[PDB]
Each structure stands twice: as C-alpha cells, then as structure tokens.
C-alpha cells in the first residue's frame, strides 16, 4: 500500500485553536445570550499537545480566538513555506452549529471556509501532503438518539 511520506522533523505544524471564554458572544449576539464558557477545554488542548509533540509535530496553540483572529491565524499558515514539512494539522475546539464553528465573539466561520485555505492552489508547498482538520464543536442542537444492539 502507498503511504504518505512522514519523516521530516518537525512533521509539520499542528495548530490548536482553543476557545474557552464566550463573554463577548453573550454580550454581543442576542441568540447566544446564555452560551457557556467551555470549561475543561484546556484538557483537550493539553492532550493534543502531548500527543502530537510525541508524534514530532510543532504545536502552535492559540487561546480564545474571535472569527477574525481565526482567519488571521490560518492566513499566516496558508502563506507559510511548508516545503520542509510532510504534514499539516489544524485542531479547532469551540462551540458550533450546522456547518460552522463560533469565534469567542459569537461570529460564525463555515468549516469549509477554513479548510479551503489549504487547497493545492492556495498553499502549493502542501501540495501532495496530508492536511488534517479535527473539529470539536456541536453541529446543531439536536440530541442523537440511541438504538439497541447486541453486545460485542
């Protein structure tokens, strides 16, 4: 089986956007009046840091980002030279809704607006290299129902 080259050190950048404080969302966006701070999110940021540092990525953490700050960070990495990297990872920890994630300011970023910054034409030094996005957020307000099955 063909496998992506994965031998550079660092392997690549692993961005962590870690949104905890939604005071601005509660203040400025009517429907998000009672959106809660994401207590415990630092435990995810730390787990990702440990995990991907162990796997030889260079971790780039960013805490409490508004939508504009998120776009600013991604633009930096879109324009960066990844020629000496074999991979790029971007982790987003935040609130969200259908197809979007929220900045701490309660503005919306469509997920595909984030990923599309790293296409081959937009970021040539990542062409042919894996680009991995992990999105920890709700994608709506519905509860996923359970169904009964036999135990394995």
């Amino acid at each position: 089986d063909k496998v992506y080259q994965m031998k550079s050190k660092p392997r690549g950048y692993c961005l962590i956007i870690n949104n905890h404080n939604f005071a601005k969302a509660r203040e400025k966006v009517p429907k998000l009046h009672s959106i809660r701070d994401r207590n415990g999110t630092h435990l995810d940021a730390g787990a990702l840091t440990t995990t991907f540092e162990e796997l030889h990525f260079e971790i780039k953490p960013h805490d409490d980002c508004t939508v504009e700050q998120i776009y600013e960070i991604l633009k930096i990495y879109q324009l960066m030279d990844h020629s000496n990297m074999d991979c790029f990872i971007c982790c987003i920890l935040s609130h969200g809704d259908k197809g979007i994630i929220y900045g701490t300011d309660g503005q919306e970023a469509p997920i595909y607006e984030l990923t599309s910054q790293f296409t081959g034409l937009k970021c040539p030094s990542l062409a042919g290299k894996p680009k991995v996005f992990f999105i920890q957020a709700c994608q709506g307000d519905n509860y996923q129902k359970g169904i009964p099955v036999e135990t394995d």
Partner: protein
C-alpha cells in the same frame, strides 16, 4: 510532472454528524478529543493508519452516553486522502 486534484489529501475529523451536539466533560475533556488522543497514543506506535484509528474513535464515542437526555454522539470523518496516513514514532 503529474497533476492531482486541488482538493486532494484532506482529512476532516468531525466530533459529530451534522445537526447534532457533541459533549464535553469539564473535569476530563471532550468525548471526541480524549478518545482521539488515547487511540493515537496507543495505535500510532503499532503502525496503524489514521482511518483505522478514527474507526476506533467512532466505536468508543458510540458507546458513551449522556444519561440526562439519553443522548449519544456519532463522530464522522470525511476524506480525500489518496494514500495511507501513518504517524511514525522514530
């Protein structure tokens, strides 16, 4: 030279299918990220690829529940990867 699609070689790991919630334990971390990290730390040294690992994350998160609402969570990867993705330790 060779040409491949503009949108090749992406992996999008979503904590949940569309329209639904994902869960965060404030004393532990989120179901999805904690499962992901555990599986990565365990399986990457074994040479397992990211799709095998995310399948395990689907399994593990599928067995958790929100007993307040009898709620579940179903993660959902999507990919344009053209090769196996492994993260070696050496």
């Amino acid at each position: 030279t060779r040409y491949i699609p503009d949108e090749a070689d992406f992996l999008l790991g979503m904590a949940t299918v569309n329209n639904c919630v994902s869960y965060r334990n404030p004393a532990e971390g989120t179901w999805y990220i904690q499962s992901l990290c555990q599986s990565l730390r365990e399986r990457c040294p074994r040479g397992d690829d990211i799709l095998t690992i995310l399948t395990e994350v689907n399994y593990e998160v599928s067995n958790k529940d929100d007993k307040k609402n009898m709620g579940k969570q179903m993660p959902q990867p999507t990919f344009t990867l053209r090769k196996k993705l492994v993260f070696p330790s050496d």
